[PDB]
């Protein structure tokens, strides 16, 4: 219902098709936060 850009369209498509399934992905605001932190001299990333 929010900034998951690649997931909003998929959920809408699944709802119209009658599936009612969710592909969560990752919010866009967290990416914005990571970019804003990296704009300072602070390294930050996600490991595996």
């Amino acid at each position: 219902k929010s900034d998951d850009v690649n997931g909003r369209t998929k959920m809408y498509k699944n709802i119209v098709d009658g599936n009612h399934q969710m592909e969560p992905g990752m919010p866009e605001s967290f990416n914005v936060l990571l970019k804003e932190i990296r704009s300072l001299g602070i390294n930050i990333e996600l490991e595996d």
């Binding site: 369209t9 809408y12 498509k13 119209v16």
Partner: peptide
């Protein structure tokens, strides 16, 4: 406050892609 974070608009290509998705 200064105005920021404008809205996203729907151009022709985006609308056509939206219709292709469904």
């Amino acid at each position: 406050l200064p105005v920021y974070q404008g809205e996203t608009t729907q151009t022709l290509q985006d609308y056509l892609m939206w219709q292709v998705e469904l």
